[PDB]
Amino acid sequence: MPKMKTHKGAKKRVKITASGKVVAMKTGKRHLNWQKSGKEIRQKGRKFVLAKPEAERIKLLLPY
Amino acid sequence: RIKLLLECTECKRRNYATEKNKRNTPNKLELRKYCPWCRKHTVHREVKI
Amino acid sequence: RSTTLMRLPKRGMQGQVPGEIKRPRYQGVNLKDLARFEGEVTPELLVR
RNA sequence: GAAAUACCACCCUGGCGCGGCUGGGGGCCUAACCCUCGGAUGGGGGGACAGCGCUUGGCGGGCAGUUUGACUGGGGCGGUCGCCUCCUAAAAGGUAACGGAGGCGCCCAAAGGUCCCCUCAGGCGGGACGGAAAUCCGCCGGAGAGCGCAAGGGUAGAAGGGGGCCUGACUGCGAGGCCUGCAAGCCGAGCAGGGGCGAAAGCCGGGCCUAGUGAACCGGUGGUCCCGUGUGGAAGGGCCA
RNA sequence: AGUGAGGGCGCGAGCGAUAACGUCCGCGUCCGAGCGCGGGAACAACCGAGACCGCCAGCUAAGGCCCCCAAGUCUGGGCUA
RNA sequence: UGAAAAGCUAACCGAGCCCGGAGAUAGCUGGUUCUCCCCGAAAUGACUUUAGGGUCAGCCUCAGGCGCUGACUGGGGCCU
RNA sequence: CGGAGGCGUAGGGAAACCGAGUCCGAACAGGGCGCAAAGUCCGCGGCCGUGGACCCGAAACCGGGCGAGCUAGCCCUGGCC
RNA sequence: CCCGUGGUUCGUGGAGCCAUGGGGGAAUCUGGGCGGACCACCGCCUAAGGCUAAGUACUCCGGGUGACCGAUAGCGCACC
RNA sequence: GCGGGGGGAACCUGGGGAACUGAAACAUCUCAGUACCCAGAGGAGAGGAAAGAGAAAUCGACUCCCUGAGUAGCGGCGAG
């Protein structure tokens, strides 16, 4: 009966501050290919896209 | 695989920094420079295959 | 859409270092005994 | 001579001695096993084999269960499906079309830094080996030659041509903006550590710029030295690169 | 919450034969989805016009007034026959 | 089975008929019900084994708050 | 009446943990805040997720049975030409 | 204990314990599996036999109650 | 001289054990150990005194309810 988040989601990053938000590793590109190099590698803080992150939310709601 | 192969720099056992590079013209010749997070800057060296 | 850095592996038995947020403010503002309360006495306490 | 010689050391190339390990194969049986005898529980033929149990590798439609893309002035066959540039976007920006055109899925170890110098093609006139066109002299020139690579923008007040010295084609990072609904991709003063080009006023966090690009999973390696399912460690594993 | 395909007309480029109630995009209107009234014979999108409901009331669009059918077989000046 | 075309197999088995999974599945069609009042959609974007589907963007409605901020107009820069 | 609980009551982090502070970090620069601005429960209701979830609608796949007085075959056994 | 497999929140994995199909192939309480793949610890339990009550299931059959139905709903079936 | 067998709507134990549909394809996966064939003990069987739990120098048969988190986690880490 209890739904329970795209557990998956909760798992793959997918984090919330009960304030009303979430984030995933900047994940812009990184930790994958990258015969890239430096400065580019400057993107690993965290990030969050609004609008959309609702589904995410309620799917989750209950734990993570 | 082409005269373009990827290497990267490491420094006197006290770190390693990265970046790709090539193969063509002077091939192997690979000292270079760069600076690790070792100490404050430091040679580094480069090479590392 | 994204690698990840949070991995909670093959298991089920973690340790502890009890992080229960308690407040000297609820405490002294109006629900205490300025010297001895202890986890034990915190039931009413909204920090358990 | 590349070496020095006795007699004592270890170590090999190569063949034979003997010994522990174990790989290859050739002979009637025999008692399990099979067929068995032909009129009987005893005889007969085969017999360590293959029958057969399990694990092994491999043939393998005979069988099973799926799939074998979208666009497109029908379907299919034909085209074609990512990115840069120009046109049509009609003047902000910005838009199809089986509309026009045309390139890229490299690299450049130094076209990466900075300091110092220089400065086009082509026209003309005069000249050794020339000899429509090198090389040098003499004038002339919104710079149309030039900048790996296509276009377009720019632009020799050089980003362009030459010399010196050097790695920032740095880590930590960034405020604040381009565009975009998603994610993208993209622009960046300035603070820190840390260096390099000048003495320095400062430039340098790759190139003259707009294409050389790919989530997520999965797994590798160089860390790290965070976690370990009683504790010490460890298989294993979390974040970095 | 619903459409995620639509068509027409005018202007501006494609294309197509500068052909089609063709198909491509854009500025506008449109028509659906109101676009139910006038209307041009009758005609989803061409000019007029937005209908909450009445009137055995009057002024008007467009576009009309010999008749079929409301409205001058007006006047004035021509030109075709 | 089958002197085999894909034949016949309780009157139409190119894989029988009854019951069962089951009310399979159904971006496809149908059908989708009292009165009245307000507003008023789009029939486009973006990637999609999607392309008559869908997630997000564009337009709508009811509620809070901002409350003169809007289309359009006047004027004067700096853009074509 | 039953007081195992689940939601609040700081959170920040992959964690070690720190703690209203915080991870990056050697960085005084950013992002999660701090900001309580209390929720928590019962109901009524717009509303998804699982369950057939506006309703009846198919090709068919799978299990267990049902039949050679269906039909073709083959076996046994008389007859007729 | 080797591989071949079942369980289990485990789908192949660092993957444990019980459980068995193959081959190996033993210990009597200093015994032996179990906590941590595994190794050094402490701890745990005592395996490879046996018996059954009691608390949740089920509905043929009986009783009773129903903001559960009225003869096309109700079991299809209110009566050969 | 005994026993069984033969039944029985549902519950029940073990025996053996499937496509759909989902994963908008679908081969791991999925429905699921679900449907169904079976054998069998009952009036209820099932399980039922620990080579258990769990790490506190702790508990103590087995079964069923509420809670334990839908977390701990299993995985074309995707539907689930």
Short mmCIF file of N, CA and C (backbone and C1' of nucleotides) in Angstrom, two decimals, chain H residues 6-67:
data_model
loop_
_atom_site.label_atom_id
_atom_site.label_comp_id
_atom_site.label_asym_id
_atom_site.label_seq_id
_atom_site.Cartn_x
_atom_site.Cartn_y
_atom_site.Cartn_z
P G H 6 19.43 -22.49 -8.19
"O5'" G H 6 18.70 -23.27 -7.02
"C5'" G H 6 17.46 -23.90 -7.27
"C4'" G H 6 16.78 -24.26 -5.98
"C3'" G H 6 16.45 -23.12 -5.04
"O3'" G H 6 15.22 -22.46 -5.42
"C1'" G H 6 17.47 -24.87 -3.83
P G H 7 15.08 -20.85 -5.26
"O5'" G H 7 15.20 -20.59 -3.69
"C5'" G H 7 14.05 -20.70 -2.83
"C4'" G H 7 14.43 -21.04 -1.39
"C3'" G H 7 14.53 -19.89 -0.39
"O3'" G H 7 13.22 -19.64 0.11
"C1'" G H 7 16.29 -21.47 -0.04
P U H 8 12.44 -18.31 -0.32
"O5'" U H 8 13.10 -17.22 0.61
"C5'" U H 8 13.51 -17.57 1.92
"C4'" U H 8 14.72 -16.78 2.32
"C3'" U H 8 14.75 -15.36 1.80
"O3'" U H 8 13.97 -14.54 2.65
"C1'" U H 8 16.94 -16.35 1.91
P U H 9 12.86 -13.57 2.04
"O5'" U H 9 13.71 -12.51 1.21
"C5'" U H 9 13.09 -11.65 0.25
"C4'" U H 9 13.95 -10.42 0.00
"C3'" U H 9 15.43 -10.68 -0.29
"O3'" U H 9 15.67 -11.01 -1.65
"C1'" U H 9 15.28 -9.10 1.43
P C H 10 15.72 -12.55 -2.08
"O5'" C H 10 17.06 -12.67 -2.92
"C5'" C H 10 17.34 -11.77 -3.99
"C4'" C H 10 18.82 -11.65 -4.17
"C3'" C H 10 19.54 -13.00 -4.27
"O3'" C H 10 19.61 -13.43 -5.63
"C1'" C H 10 20.45 -11.76 -2.50
P G H 11 20.74 -14.47 -6.09
"O5'" G H 11 21.97 -13.51 -6.41
"C5'" G H 11 21.77 -12.25 -7.06
"C4'" G H 11 21.27 -12.47 -8.46
"C3'" G H 11 21.60 -11.42 -9.50
"O3'" G H 11 22.91 -11.70 -9.96
"C1'" G H 11 19.37 -12.17 -9.75
P U H 12 23.40 -11.17 -11.40
"O5'" U H 12 24.97 -11.40 -11.31
"C5'" U H 12 25.72 -11.02 -10.14
"C4'" U H 12 26.54 -12.20 -9.61
"C3'" U H 12 27.42 -12.90 -10.65
"O3'" U H 12 28.79 -12.49 -10.49
"C1'" U H 12 25.89 -14.43 -9.65
P G H 13 29.41 -11.35 -11.45
"O5'" G H 13 30.52 -10.61 -10.58
"C5'" G H 13 30.94 -11.08 -9.30
"C4'" G H 13 30.06 -10.51 -8.21
"C3'" G H 13 30.56 -10.76 -6.79
"O3'" G H 13 31.38 -9.68 -6.34
"C1'" G H 13 28.32 -11.50 -6.97
P G H 14 32.98 -9.87 -6.21
"O5'" G H 14 33.16 -10.82 -4.95
"C5'" G H 14 34.37 -11.55 -4.74
"C4'" G H 14 34.65 -11.67 -3.26
"C3'" G H 14 33.47 -12.17 -2.45
"O3'" G H 14 33.51 -13.56 -2.24
"C1'" G H 14 34.08 -10.08 -1.65
P A H 15 32.18 -14.33 -1.80
"O5'" A H 15 31.88 -13.78 -0.35
"C5'" A H 15 31.15 -14.58 0.58
"C4'" A H 15 29.68 -14.66 0.19
"C3'" A H 15 29.25 -15.56 -0.96
"O3'" A H 15 28.93 -16.90 -0.57
"C1'" A H 15 28.02 -13.51 -0.90
P G H 16 29.95 -17.76 0.33
"O5'" G H 16 29.32 -17.62 1.81
"C5'" G H 16 30.13 -17.31 2.97
"C4'" G H 16 29.28 -16.97 4.22
"C3'" G H 16 28.29 -18.00 4.77
"O3'" G H 16 29.01 -18.88 5.67
"C1'" G H 16 27.29 -15.80 4.71
P C H 17 28.76 -20.48 5.65
"O5'" C H 17 27.38 -20.67 6.43
"C5'" C H 17 27.31 -20.56 7.86
"C4'" C H 17 25.87 -20.65 8.32
"C3'" C H 17 25.11 -21.83 7.75
"O3'" C H 17 25.25 -22.95 8.63
"C1'" C H 17 23.89 -19.84 7.34
P C H 18 25.34 -24.44 8.03
"O5'" C H 18 23.82 -24.80 7.71
"C5'" C H 18 22.86 -24.87 8.76
"C4'" C H 18 21.46 -24.97 8.20
"C3'" C H 18 21.24 -26.03 7.15
"O3'" C H 18 21.01 -27.30 7.79
"C1'" C H 18 20.28 -23.97 6.46
P A H 19 21.57 -28.66 7.14
"O5'" A H 19 20.73 -28.78 5.79
"C5'" A H 19 19.33 -28.52 5.79
"C4'" A H 19 18.83 -28.29 4.39
"C3'" A H 19 19.41 -29.23 3.35
"O3'" A H 19 18.79 -30.49 3.38
"C1'" A H 19 19.29 -27.06 2.46
P U H 20 19.71 -31.78 3.17
"O5'" U H 20 18.91 -32.68 2.13
"C5'" U H 20 19.60 -33.64 1.34
"C4'" U H 20 19.75 -33.13 -0.07
"C3'" U H 20 20.78 -33.87 -0.90
"O3'" U H 20 20.12 -34.98 -1.51
"C1'" U H 20 20.81 -31.50 -1.29
P G H 21 20.93 -35.96 -2.49
"O5'" G H 21 21.09 -35.14 -3.84
"C5'" G H 21 20.35 -35.49 -5.00
"C4'" G H 21 21.22 -35.38 -6.22
"C3'" G H 21 22.50 -36.18 -6.11
"O3'" G H 21 22.30 -37.46 -6.65
"C1'" G H 21 22.98 -33.97 -6.84
P G H 22 23.44 -38.55 -6.48
"O5'" G H 22 24.75 -37.70 -6.22
"C5'" G H 22 26.02 -38.28 -6.36
"C4'" G H 22 26.65 -37.83 -7.64
"C3'" G H 22 28.17 -37.81 -7.57
"O3'" G H 22 28.69 -39.07 -7.97
"C1'" G H 22 27.43 -35.67 -8.09
P G H 23 29.29 -40.06 -6.87
"O5'" G H 23 30.74 -39.47 -6.55
"C5'" G H 23 31.80 -39.58 -7.49
"C4'" G H 23 33.06 -38.96 -6.93
"C3'" G H 23 33.54 -39.52 -5.61
"O3'" G H 23 34.33 -40.69 -5.79
"C1'" G H 23 33.60 -37.16 -5.53
P G H 24 35.03 -41.37 -4.52
"O5'" G H 24 36.08 -40.29 -4.03
"C5'" G H 24 36.48 -40.23 -2.67
"C4'" G H 24 37.03 -38.86 -2.32
"C3'" G H 24 37.36 -38.67 -0.84
"O3'" G H 24 38.65 -39.19 -0.52
"C1'" G H 24 36.02 -36.88 -1.56
P G H 25 38.79 -40.45 0.49
"O5'" G H 25 38.47 -39.83 1.91
"C5'" G H 25 38.69 -38.45 2.17
"C4'" G H 25 37.50 -37.88 2.88
"C3'" G H 25 37.07 -38.68 4.09
"O3'" G H 25 37.86 -38.63 5.24
"C1'" G H 25 35.19 -38.32 2.85
P A H 26 38.13 -39.99 6.02
"O5'" A H 26 38.15 -39.59 7.57
"C5'" A H 26 37.14 -40.05 8.47
"C4'" A H 26 36.90 -38.98 9.52
"C3'" A H 26 36.90 -39.39 10.99
"O3'" A H 26 38.24 -39.52 11.43
"C1'" A H 26 35.27 -37.71 10.55
P A H 27 38.53 -39.76 12.99
"O5'" A H 27 38.03 -38.41 13.68
"C5'" A H 27 37.51 -38.42 14.99
"C4'" A H 27 37.22 -37.01 15.45
"C3'" A H 27 36.59 -36.90 16.82
"O3'" A H 27 37.55 -36.96 17.89
"C1'" A H 27 35.31 -35.64 15.32
P U H 28 37.48 -38.15 19.00
"O5'" U H 28 36.17 -37.87 19.89
"C5'" U H 28 36.01 -36.65 20.65
"C4'" U H 28 34.89 -36.78 21.70
"C3'" U H 28 35.10 -37.81 22.80
"O3'" U H 28 35.58 -37.24 24.04
"C1'" U H 28 32.86 -37.85 21.94
P C H 29 36.23 -35.75 24.10
"O5'" C H 29 35.00 -34.77 24.40
"C5'" C H 29 35.04 -33.39 23.98
"C4'" C H 29 34.16 -32.50 24.85
"C3'" C H 29 34.42 -32.50 26.35
"O3'" C H 29 35.45 -31.54 26.64
"C1'" C H 29 32.07 -32.37 25.85
P U H 30 36.97 -31.83 26.21
"O5'" U H 30 37.15 -31.06 24.83
"C5'" U H 30 37.10 -29.64 24.79
"C4'" U H 30 38.47 -29.07 24.49
"C3'" U H 30 39.09 -29.43 23.14
"O3'" U H 30 38.62 -28.57 22.11
"C1'" U H 30 40.70 -29.68 24.85
P G H 31 38.14 -29.20 20.71
"O5'" G H 31 37.37 -30.51 21.15
"C5'" G H 31 37.78 -31.79 20.69
"C4'" G H 31 36.57 -32.58 20.30
"C3'" G H 31 35.77 -31.94 19.18
"O3'" G H 31 36.24 -32.44 17.93
"C1'" G H 31 34.35 -32.40 21.01
P G H 32 37.03 -31.47 16.90
"O5'" G H 32 35.87 -30.65 16.16
"C5'" G H 32 35.09 -31.25 15.12
"C4'" G H 32 33.66 -30.71 15.11
"C3'" G H 32 33.41 -29.27 14.69
"O3'" G H 32 33.37 -29.08 13.27
"C1'" G H 32 32.10 -29.77 16.60
P G H 33 33.34 -27.58 12.66
"O5'" G H 33 31.79 -27.31 12.32
"C5'" G H 33 31.34 -26.99 10.98
"C4'" G H 33 30.01 -26.25 11.02
"C3'" G H 33 30.06 -24.74 11.28
"O3'" G H 33 30.17 -23.99 10.06
"C1'" G H 33 28.65 -25.75 12.88
P C H 34 30.55 -22.41 10.08
"O5'" C H 34 29.52 -21.75 11.12
"C5'" C H 34 28.11 -21.69 10.84
"C4'" C H 34 27.34 -21.05 11.98
"C3'" C H 34 27.86 -19.72 12.50
"O3'" C H 34 27.54 -18.63 11.68
"C1'" C H 34 27.39 -21.05 14.34
P G H 35 28.63 -17.47 11.49
"O5'" G H 35 28.20 -16.34 12.53
"C5'" G H 35 27.34 -15.25 12.16
"C4'" G H 35 27.72 -14.00 12.92
"C3'" G H 35 29.18 -13.57 12.80
"O3'" G H 35 29.34 -12.67 11.75
"C1'" G H 35 28.67 -13.75 15.06
P G H 36 28.88 -13.14 10.32
"O5'" G H 36 29.88 -12.45 9.32
"C5'" G H 36 30.10 -11.07 9.34
"C4'" G H 36 31.53 -10.81 9.71
"C3'" G H 36 32.52 -11.85 9.23
"O3'" G H 36 32.81 -11.75 7.82
"C1'" G H 36 32.96 -11.26 11.48
P A H 37 31.73 -12.30 6.75
"O5'" A H 37 32.53 -13.13 5.67
"C5'" A H 37 31.80 -13.89 4.72
"C4'" A H 37 32.73 -14.69 3.85
"C3'" A H 37 33.73 -15.55 4.59
"O3'" A H 37 33.11 -16.80 4.91
"C1'" A H 37 34.79 -14.38 2.80
P C H 38 33.84 -17.84 5.91
"O5'" C H 38 35.39 -17.47 5.82
"C5'" C H 38 36.24 -18.07 4.84
"C4'" C H 38 37.63 -17.46 4.88
"C3'" C H 38 38.38 -17.51 6.19
"O3'" C H 38 38.99 -18.77 6.38
"C1'" C H 38 38.68 -15.40 5.21
P C H 39 39.40 -19.22 7.86
"O5'" C H 39 40.58 -18.23 8.29
"C5'" C H 39 41.95 -18.59 8.08
"C4'" C H 39 42.89 -17.70 8.89
"C3'" C H 39 42.70 -17.67 10.40
"O3'" C H 39 43.33 -18.75 11.06
"C1'" C H 39 42.92 -15.47 9.62
P A H 40 42.94 -19.07 12.59
"O5'" A H 40 43.49 -17.80 13.40
"C5'" A H 40 44.85 -17.74 13.84
"C4'" A H 40 45.06 -16.55 14.75
"C3'" A H 40 44.15 -16.45 15.96
"O3'" A H 40 44.51 -17.23 17.07
"C1'" A H 40 44.17 -14.38 14.92
P C H 41 43.39 -17.58 18.16
"O5'" C H 41 43.19 -16.25 19.01
"C5'" C H 41 42.26 -16.23 20.08
"C4'" C H 41 41.70 -14.85 20.30
"C3'" C H 41 40.44 -14.87 21.15
"O3'" C H 41 40.71 -15.05 22.54
"C1'" C H 41 39.99 -13.62 19.21
P C H 42 40.15 -16.36 23.29
"O5'" C H 42 38.70 -15.91 23.77
"C5'" C H 42 38.54 -14.88 24.75
"C4'" C H 42 37.27 -14.08 24.49
"C3'" C H 42 35.95 -14.83 24.55
"O3'" C H 42 35.45 -15.03 25.86
"C1'" C H 42 36.01 -13.59 22.58
P G H 43 34.64 -16.38 26.19
"O5'" G H 43 33.16 -16.04 25.70
"C5'" G H 43 32.65 -14.71 25.76
"C4'" G H 43 31.62 -14.53 24.69
"C3'" G H 43 30.61 -15.67 24.60
"O3'" G H 43 29.52 -15.55 25.51
"C1'" G H 43 31.42 -15.18 22.45
P C H 44 28.56 -16.81 25.77
"O5'" C H 44 28.10 -17.25 24.32
"C5'" C H 44 27.15 -16.48 23.60
"C4'" C H 44 26.58 -17.30 22.49
"C3'" C H 44 26.05 -18.65 22.90
"O3'" C H 44 24.75 -18.55 23.43
"C1'" C H 44 27.22 -18.82 20.86
P C H 45 24.19 -19.73 24.38
"O5'" C H 45 24.01 -20.98 23.41
"C5'" C H 45 22.86 -21.10 22.57
"C4'" C H 45 23.07 -22.19 21.56
"C3'" C H 45 23.08 -23.60 22.10
"O3'" C H 45 21.78 -24.13 22.13
"C1'" C H 45 24.90 -23.30 20.63
P U H 46 21.50 -25.45 22.98
"O5'" U H 46 21.08 -26.55 21.92
"C5'" U H 46 21.46 -27.92 22.11
"C4'" U H 46 22.70 -28.19 21.31
"C3'" U H 46 23.44 -29.51 21.50
"O3'" U H 46 22.81 -30.53 20.69
"C1'" U H 46 24.95 -27.67 21.38
P A H 47 23.58 -31.91 20.32
"O5'" A H 47 23.09 -32.16 18.82
"C5'" A H 47 21.80 -31.71 18.40
"C4'" A H 47 21.82 -31.23 16.95
"C3'" A H 47 21.93 -32.27 15.84
"O3'" A H 47 20.65 -32.80 15.52
"C1'" A H 47 23.31 -30.39 15.37
P A H 48 20.48 -33.89 14.34
"O5'" A H 48 21.34 -33.30 13.13
"C5'" A H 48 20.83 -33.33 11.80
"C4'" A H 48 21.41 -34.50 11.04
"C3'" A H 48 21.26 -35.86 11.71
"O3'" A H 48 20.01 -36.46 11.43
"C1'" A H 48 23.49 -35.60 11.03
P G H 49 19.69 -37.90 12.05
"O5'" G H 49 18.76 -37.59 13.32
"C5'" G H 49 17.41 -37.12 13.19
"C4'" G H 49 16.42 -38.17 13.70
"C3'" G H 49 15.17 -37.65 14.37
"O3'" G H 49 14.18 -37.39 13.40
"C1'" G H 49 16.12 -39.39 15.69
P G H 50 12.92 -36.48 13.79
"O5'" G H 50 12.20 -37.31 14.95
"C5'" G H 50 11.82 -38.68 14.75
"C4'" G H 50 11.24 -39.27 16.01
"C3'" G H 50 10.08 -38.48 16.58
"O3'" G H 50 8.90 -38.84 15.92
"C1'" G H 50 11.56 -39.02 18.32
P C H 51 7.78 -37.73 15.65
"O5'" C H 51 7.13 -37.50 17.10
"C5'" C H 51 6.14 -38.39 17.61
"C4'" C H 51 5.36 -37.76 18.76
"C3'" C H 51 4.81 -36.34 18.59
"O3'" C H 51 3.58 -36.27 17.87
"C1'" C H 51 5.79 -36.56 20.71
P U H 52 3.29 -35.02 16.88
"O5'" U H 52 2.37 -34.05 17.73
"C5'" U H 52 0.98 -34.27 17.82
"C4'" U H 52 0.50 -33.77 19.13
"C3'" U H 52 0.78 -32.29 19.36
"O3'" U H 52 -0.23 -31.46 18.83
"C1'" U H 52 1.55 -33.50 21.21
P A H 53 0.09 -29.92 18.55
"O5'" A H 53 -1.35 -29.25 18.51
"C5'" A H 53 -1.86 -28.46 19.60
"C4'" A H 53 -2.29 -29.36 20.74
"C3'" A H 53 -3.01 -28.66 21.88
"O3'" A H 53 -4.41 -28.68 21.64
"C1'" A H 53 -1.30 -30.04 22.74
P A H 54 -5.12 -27.41 20.97
"O5'" A H 54 -4.67 -26.18 21.87
"C5'" A H 54 -5.62 -25.43 22.62
"C4'" A H 54 -4.99 -24.16 23.12
"C3'" A H 54 -4.54 -23.20 22.03
"O3'" A H 54 -5.59 -22.29 21.72
"C1'" A H 54 -2.74 -23.59 23.51
P G H 55 -6.21 -22.27 20.25
"O5'" G H 55 -5.98 -20.78 19.74
"C5'" G H 55 -6.60 -19.67 20.38
"C4'" G H 55 -5.59 -18.58 20.61
"C3'" G H 55 -4.94 -18.03 19.34
"O3'" G H 55 -5.63 -16.84 18.91
"C1'" G H 55 -3.27 -18.69 20.91
P U H 56 -6.87 -16.93 17.87
"O5'" U H 56 -6.25 -16.61 16.43
"C5'" U H 56 -6.25 -15.27 15.88
"C4'" U H 56 -5.48 -15.19 14.56
"C3'" U H 56 -6.04 -15.87 13.31
"O3'" U H 56 -7.09 -15.20 12.62
"C1'" U H 56 -3.88 -16.60 13.53
P A H 57 -8.28 -16.07 11.97
"O5'" A H 57 -7.56 -17.05 10.92
"C5'" A H 57 -6.80 -16.55 9.80
"C4'" A H 57 -6.66 -17.61 8.72
"C3'" A H 57 -7.96 -18.13 8.12
"O3'" A H 57 -8.46 -17.31 7.10
"C1'" A H 57 -6.68 -19.96 8.75
P C H 58 -10.04 -17.02 7.05
"O5'" C H 58 -10.66 -18.37 6.50
"C5'" C H 58 -10.35 -18.80 5.20
"C4'" C H 58 -10.73 -20.23 5.06
"C3'" C H 58 -12.18 -20.51 5.39
"O3'" C H 58 -13.07 -20.13 4.35
"C1'" C H 58 -10.86 -22.04 6.54
P U H 59 -13.91 -18.78 4.51
"O5'" U H 59 -15.39 -19.17 4.06
"C5'" U H 59 -15.59 -19.96 2.90
"C4'" U H 59 -16.01 -21.33 3.32
"C3'" U H 59 -17.39 -21.38 3.93
"O3'" U H 59 -18.34 -21.58 2.92
"C1'" U H 59 -15.88 -22.54 5.32
P C H 60 -19.78 -22.16 3.31
"O5'" C H 60 -19.60 -23.74 3.31
"C5'" C H 60 -19.82 -24.48 2.13
"C4'" C H 60 -20.40 -25.83 2.46
"C3'" C H 60 -21.67 -25.86 3.29
"O3'" C H 60 -22.79 -25.76 2.41
"C1'" C H 60 -20.14 -27.59 3.92
P C H 61 -24.24 -25.35 2.98
"O5'" C H 61 -24.27 -25.95 4.46
"C5'" C H 61 -24.79 -27.26 4.70
"C4'" C H 61 -24.81 -27.58 6.18
"C3'" C H 61 -25.49 -26.61 7.13
"O3'" C H 61 -26.90 -26.74 7.16
"C1'" C H 61 -23.46 -27.27 8.07
P G H 62 -27.80 -25.45 7.51
"O5'" G H 62 -27.59 -25.20 9.07
"C5'" G H 62 -28.44 -25.84 10.03
"C4'" G H 62 -28.27 -25.23 11.41
"C3'" G H 62 -28.55 -23.75 11.55
"O3'" G H 62 -29.92 -23.47 11.68
"C1'" G H 62 -26.55 -24.21 12.64
P G H 63 -30.40 -21.94 11.71
"O5'" G H 63 -29.61 -21.35 12.95
"C5'" G H 63 -30.07 -21.55 14.27
"C4'" G H 63 -29.64 -20.40 15.12
"C3'" G H 63 -29.99 -19.08 14.49
"O3'" G H 63 -31.26 -18.67 14.90
"C1'" G H 63 -27.73 -19.05 15.05
P G H 64 -32.01 -17.55 14.06
"O5'" G H 64 -31.17 -16.22 14.34
"C5'" G H 64 -31.27 -15.53 15.59
"C4'" G H 64 -30.07 -14.63 15.80
"C3'" G H 64 -29.97 -13.38 14.94
"O3'" G H 64 -30.65 -12.29 15.56
"C1'" G H 64 -27.91 -14.52 14.92
P U H 65 -31.50 -11.27 14.67
"O5'" U H 65 -30.46 -10.16 14.21
"C5'" U H 65 -30.14 -9.05 15.06
"C4'" U H 65 -28.88 -8.37 14.56
"C3'" U H 65 -29.00 -7.59 13.26
"O3'" U H 65 -29.33 -6.23 13.51
"C1'" U H 65 -27.21 -9.11 13.10
P G H 66 -30.14 -5.37 12.40
"O5'" G H 66 -29.11 -5.17 11.19
"C5'" G H 66 -28.36 -3.96 11.04
"C4'" G H 66 -27.52 -4.02 9.77
"C3'" G H 66 -28.24 -3.80 8.44
"O3'" G H 66 -28.29 -2.44 7.96
"C1'" G H 66 -26.95 -5.78 8.32
P A H 67 -27.28 -1.32 8.51
"O5'" A H 67 -27.47 -0.14 7.46
"C5'" A H 67 -27.68 1.19 7.90
"C4'" A H 67 -27.79 2.11 6.71
"C3'" A H 67 -26.67 1.99 5.71
"O3'" A H 67 -26.91 0.94 4.80
"C1'" A H 67 -26.93 4.25 6.24
#
